């Protein structure tokens with residue numbers, strides 16, 4: 001029982017890995033170990049969608065990319081570079097790294113980032129964006145874990161997309177899909193399904209974020 | 218028009234101004250000027266509760282206080298000193314000031330804080346908290362305005378609590394009352410009723426936050 005904070009994370013971006021995407025939106029949801037522990041273990045078929053913990057730290061930010069979003073990404077996320085820039089959104093810069101550091105500094109250590117498909121998308125992309133910056137990465141010292149690999153172990157004890165798992169467990173469609181905060185809240189609910197077994201798995205399988213290879217560059 | 222960013226603000230605290238309260242929770246919701254203007258003018262009787270603008274910066278944080286919450290405060294907020302401490306929440310410190318500054322810096326200037334009963338509670342309390350800190354105030358250079366004074370001028374052109382105003386306009390009770398994020402989203406919904414007239418009033422009555430006198434000390 002070492003991981004004191006789980007930070008549920010989701011990124012929106014301009015496109016898929018092959019297009020060399022840039023982050024357009026981020027959401028961080030810091031939840032203390034004890035808040036997940038004291039969430040009710042799901043009963044019934046289907047169980048009701050769990051209530052999020054009262055004590056929560058939330059950060060959600062819109063970020064203007066250097067390159068335009070793909071038509072498909074704009075459609076699902078509701079975001080475009082044009083609209084982000086005309087509403088005065090700033091680039092993924094050093095000030096944002098300072099912002100994230102101060103947010104992470106407020107959380108009891110050790111910390112672990114939780115992201116759906118994080119190992120193939122969210123973590124390597126974030127590593128790439130932070131690599132561009134002159135100031136050292138604020139995610140050095142923090143851990144990370146993929147919730148797909150987490151739920152795959154919890155279920156086995158066909159689609160593993162965020163929506164599919166949410167509808168399987170709760171017989172309800174997720175709200176605000178493909179938005180950073182919406183997907184984080186959807187991720188939280190799925191992780192609140194068996195939160196004690198989830199936390200034990202995180203402890204055993206969480207790896208340092210500094211071990212994550214960048215998506216590109 | 219000049220206020221490019223409206224930051225909707227709400228604080229939760231240990232009690233009333235007579236008890237010399239300390240902040241237990243804060244929420245900042247940054248909305249660009251155009252995002253408010255491009256909301257549909259609430260049509261219908263009653264009109265539906267509008268969705269928040271897509272492009273939004275949000276920061277919600279729980280803060281451990283130096284003194285215990287009053288019985289009545291813990292009941293409505295659902296927060297307590299012990300629960301904030303046991304979940305590893307940090308005090309209103311210099312790192313929080315850096316966080317606030319980095320968050321505000323991401324917003325196009327000038328900025329204006331919007332809070333319900335802000336002139337008599339939110340702004341003076343936040344001024345007291347920032348006055349304890351060694352680092353310069355992050356809210357220096359930002360403007361502030363009370364949404365009660367805003368609505369009273371727009372409506373007139375009996376209960377003025379956040380819940381009473383929301384119920385009159387939308388015929389529904391607000392959700393997540395007396396929580397920092399819940400009250401900000403409720404405030405944002407009310408301010409989306411007549412956004413163009415709201416922004417016009419903000420540019421007319423926005424005063425520098427540096428002119429706000431501290432609640433105590």
Ligand SMILES: Cc1cn([C@H]2C[C@H](O)[C@@H](COP(=O)(O)O)O2)c(=O)[nH]c1=O
Nearest residue numbers: 011012013014015016072073077178183
């Ligand atoms: C699901 C999906 C995501 N993406 C990109 C855009 C999203 O901002 C980013 C993150 O995926 P997400 O919206 O499922 O969280 O991946 C696509 O380009 N096409 C797709 O079909």
Ligand SMILES: Cc1cn([C@H]2C[C@H](O)[C@@H](COP(=O)(O)O)O2)c(=O)[nH]c1=O
Nearest residue numbers: 228229230231232233289290294395400
């Ligand atoms: C409305 C109300 C607020 N308060 C204090 C505690 C809250 O954290 C703080 C902010 O009020 P709020 O919850 O309406 O936003 O003021 C009381 O102590 N008693 C009350 O009846």
Ligand code: NA
Nearest residue numbers: 010011116183
């Ligand atoms: Na995602």
Ligand code: NA
Nearest residue numbers: 227228333400
């Ligand atoms: Na209030």
Ligand SMILES: [Zn+2]
Nearest residue numbers: 010178179183
């Ligand atoms: Zn997403």
Ligand SMILES: [Zn+2]
Nearest residue numbers: 227395396400
């Ligand atoms: Zn409140």
